[PDB]
Design a protein around this nucleic acid. Structure first.
Ligand code: ANP
Ligand code: ANP
Ligand code: ANP
Lengths: 311, 311, 311
DNA sequence: TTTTTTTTT
DNA sequence: AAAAAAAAA
């Protein structure tokens, strides 16, 4: 939460600063987490300038060794937002954390985008209810976003729907490259008001249709790695929350399970957490954890009512 | 609805524009939704030209963050065409939406192509009746299209049959690759007069007989992903409506239902909606929803009269 | 009805053409309906050659969008051959269409092959009587074909039997693969004289005894899909007529009807029409429609006289 | 030296 | 029950 204007200090030119602004950098911490080469490659910058700049990023953000205790005390206050249902709150142990990346595993009709809606509204609850009190931006990439459902959840939690819709900064990606511009604009929007959550329904879906590899493929992974790193660039700074929804890739000639998310290893190593969603009978659905260091594997039911997620 | 001629501006060469025309691009928005690489790969184009071009696509079509409220106000006016019967209008909540992809699940004799006929006529009704007032193109791929039925529905809704048949741009695919050329020609036809609906009886049927995988298969999915993406390219621009009819693939060694549509995951993740059609006794048939974020699951009867869909 | 020699034009080598001849292709339209990959896979062909070839197939056969009206005007002239009895002519609304695939549903002693005989003779009637004036080829696969009955029908319609037998190109399949070679030879024979009708008594019967699946099965369906596609390749070109006779598969642990044709979904989705034949008392039999988009379900009697089909 | 994708009957 | 095949800096 530290604007570059604070770096308009110690002899840096304000127009040099406004050169820096165009990189999509808008906070001192973003400069602190910027690799030297990215900062060099942009034109009109001698490396010594970067010595000054990075010296200032160190000047504001400490980057040394830290006690495990202090880290624990700073871990004490992560919000971990409620999902809007109890059993998920038990699975996730209080729900999805801020400052992290999450994952929807499903085949279809698993209510993953549904959960994205309910989270999108429930971030706006007062913190006592677990909401981050943070405006929510929703990067849809299939156009499947439904305001009507947001009004339904608005009925569900008693807040006026108009207030809920006043936030929820919907955006509609098409090109794989477009998502990048949407990220830089996101970072541009982060400066003004503490947002709660980024959601992405199908970060991966564009990558199937565009990169018919291999390939390709080697380019596809090449792009995803940067995308996910940028998501870390946001999440490591402004908490809020990162949600990723993945289409599924069914194996052939496997054993006994015919699933696994597309995107290969690079997605898998990146996410702090992972989830998997099998349909039950009727509305009922089954969550099941993968790859969360915080938690033992667990599984649970939830119905998708008119209010969606519940019991 | 924005022709490339508007992009014949800001220093772009008119013959460069007429190079662009040949890509199947014919509208500014199509350029806006064009991935950078597809635009590069076509010959006679430096990437800087694409900087100009894309800069203009941004110059005409906004692509930034949007309020959920504004999206709601733009969601307020989607036509969602009547199906020509009341109970389906209740299931679908006013009928099939424009700007979307839909799905017929059936085994055979489920009247899916029947419904395609009735929709094909009923798009031509005045909007008060729910018709989009949009000419309809019908990409048949089994040759099963029957003008006679269109005359029957024409009796059903009192409009002269000749006027109905004056539209209905029937086209007869054979090769799997042929469907692609039919898509580019479709996009070419979109420029001239606002069409209502694309229909495809069996987008999938060619893919069985041609790709006897695996495979293949990995190529088959590779082709379908592009096909469906193109259908999104049309639907995200010109509304109208996309209808998909799928043959069924009966499981072996399953449990308890012996169905699921072919095409695997890639079809399933793509569609905004889904439908399923079990035969009842006599003419009567049963619709049942899958995978519509908008709607709770529901089911209903309808007879297939001489006028087809009704009660 | 367009021989490849017309494609012996625009720089194509005549020996390249005679390479093409060996594919079983013998008409320009067949090339037009040929998928790109099948044309590539055959040896001695660069893909650019296929660019030339397909460009010529487009050069002779239009493949663009068409008005529904024009399609109606071309639908106006389909012969729909008389079955040799009135009530069937009413059921089928003038009898079996050219350019289509048809289906015999029976258990045994339902006179399906009988009907195949009477059709086999009655195609030779003058068009005023509904005969296509087209030589008839009869692909038997159980050896049950009886010339004697053809002489009987010849008595029935007053034409000399010798003239009738002068056509009727009987062929006797054994292997499942053999039917394929018989198809390519059929296509080879199509060039010389407009034939009326292909008949196949038991396209499916070989598939039981050879593929004792599952399986198999997945291979069986894999083969049938190609077979049926080839039947479409013929029927979409040269009209005449396609007739399919199917043995029956009685269900176990069903409800209330213990039937359904073998071959699963893939046969079912393919046929333009379908028929079902229950024995009545004495000679009398009962036809009943399935899966004809053209027609409402109906049912009717007919006796199997010495002249077979009648009243 | 980097990089997994795909269900049918 | 039992089934392959797929490149490019
Ligand atoms: N009106 C409704 N009433 C009841 N349940 C509903 C209603 N609308 C949606 N649902 C439920 O929500 C599901 C929507 O599917 P969902 O999995 O949320 O979309 P998805 O996972 O994103 N699939 P995709 O189309 O690829 O995006 C339906 O299958 C129902 O279970
Ligand atoms: N000489 C005849 N006189 C009267 N009726 C006859 C005569 N020959 C045949 N039929 C009739 O035709 C039927 C022949 O059975 P049919 O159903 O035509 O053979 P199919 O259906 O092919 N059975 P399949 O042996 O498996 O091929 C007999 O059951 C009689 O009803
Ligand atoms: N003249 C008619 N009178 C009454 N009902 C009719 C008539 N014509 C068609 N139908 C009905 O419409 C159905 C046509 O099947 P339908 O499911 O529409 O074709 P389909 O689903 O595309 N099967 P396919 O052959 O693979 O394309 C028939 O089963 C009847 O229920």
């Amino acid at each position: 939460p530290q604007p570059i204007s604070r770096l308009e200090q110690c002899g840096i030119n304000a127009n040099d600063v406004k050169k820096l602004e165009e990189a999509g950098f808008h906070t001192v911490e973003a400069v602190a987490y910027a690799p030297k080469k990215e900062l060099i490659n942009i034109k009109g910058i001698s490396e010594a300038k970067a010595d000054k700049i990075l010296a200032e990023a160190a000047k504001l953000v400490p980057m040394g060794f830290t006690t495990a205790t202090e880290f624990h005390q700073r871990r004490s206050e992560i919000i971990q937002i409620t999902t809007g249902s109890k059993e998920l709150d038990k699975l996730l142990q209080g729900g999805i954390e801020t400052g992290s990346i999450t994952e929807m595993f499903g085949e279809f009709r698993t209510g993953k985008t549904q959960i994205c809606h309910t989270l999108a509204v429930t971030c706006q609850l007062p913190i006592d209810r677990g909401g981050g009190e943070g405006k929510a931006m929703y990067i849809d990439t299939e156009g499947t976003f439904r305001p009507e459902r947001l009004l339904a959840v608005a009925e569900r939690y008693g807040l006026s729907g108009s207030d809920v819709l006043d936030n929820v900064a919907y955006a509609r990606a098409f090109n794989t490259d477009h998502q990048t511009q949407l990220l830089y604009q996101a970072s541009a929007m982060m400066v003004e008001s503490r947002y709660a959550l980024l959601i992405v329904d199908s970060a991966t879906a564009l990558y199937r249709t565009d990169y018919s590899g291999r390939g390709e493929l080697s380019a596809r992974q090449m792009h995803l790695a940067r995308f996910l790193r940028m998501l870390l660039r946001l999440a490591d700074e402004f908490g809020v929350a990162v949600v990723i929804t993945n289409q599924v890739v069914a194996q052939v000639d496997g054993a006994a399970d015919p699933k696994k998310p597309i995107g290969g290893n690079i997605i898998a190593h990146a996410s702090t957490t992972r989830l998997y969603l099998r349909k039950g009978r009727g509305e009922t659905r089954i969550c099941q954890i993968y790859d969360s260091p915080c938690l033992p594997e667990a599984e649970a039911m939830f119905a998708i009512n008119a209010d969606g997620v519940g019991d």
